[PDB]
């Protein structure tokens, strides 16, 4: 047996909530318009540096 009988948490099986927090922070930043999305970042360089 392992040394301690510590019950495994839900978060070790469930998709991570820290990841969900970061994602739902960038979501806000896109609604506000302070992070330009990765799809439009190509379009900003397809028109520029020619």
């Amino acid at each position: 047996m392992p040394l301690t009988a510590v019950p495994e948490p839900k978060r070790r099986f469930v998709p991570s909530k820290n990841e969900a927090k970061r994602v739902m922070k960038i979501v806000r930043a896109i609604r506000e318009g302070r992070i330009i999305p990765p799809k439009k970042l190509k379009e900003m360089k397809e028109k520029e540096k020619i």
Binding site: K10, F13, V14, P15
Partner: protein
């Protein structure tokens, strides 16, 4: 003295502050009901017994409804997000009320949540809707 002798002799001028009368009489600030009904001629403890309120909960060393009704008058007197709502829409439309099946579903209940969490959140969804 050495420094005071020069400062009382110099043309710089003293930084005179007459803040002695302000030390005794400090205006009451935290409650406008008390701020209107506080006799400044009376003391602290006299203004407490005048209003009715107990000033010291321990019995003091030494020898010792007009407004409290107004206080009693003013003292007797969480939504869900777009994604959470749409998630509960999916669960209800696919299952309905079978919470055992609803929580054993890998596709919609991605966070492996209990039955109690689901029935509480769905009733919040149902109260805000029809």
């Amino acid at each position: 003295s050495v420094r005071k002798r020069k400062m009382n002799r110099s043309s710089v001028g003293k930084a005179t502050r007459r803040n002695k009368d302000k030390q005794r009489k400090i205006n009451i600030q935290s409650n406008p009901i008390i701020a209107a009904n506080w006799d400044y001629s009376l003391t602290m403890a006299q203004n407490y017994k005048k209003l009715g309120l107990r000033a010291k909960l321990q019995t003091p060393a030494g020898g010792k409804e007009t407004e409290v009704v107004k206080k009693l008058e003013e003292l007797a007197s969480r939504s869900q997000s777009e994604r959470e709502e749409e998630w509960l829409e999916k669960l209800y439309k696919k299952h309905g009320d079978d919470y055992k099946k609803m929580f054993f579903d890998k596709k919609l209940n991605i966070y492996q949540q209990s039955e109690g969490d689901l029935k509480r959140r769905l009733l919040r969804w149902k109260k805000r809707n029809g």
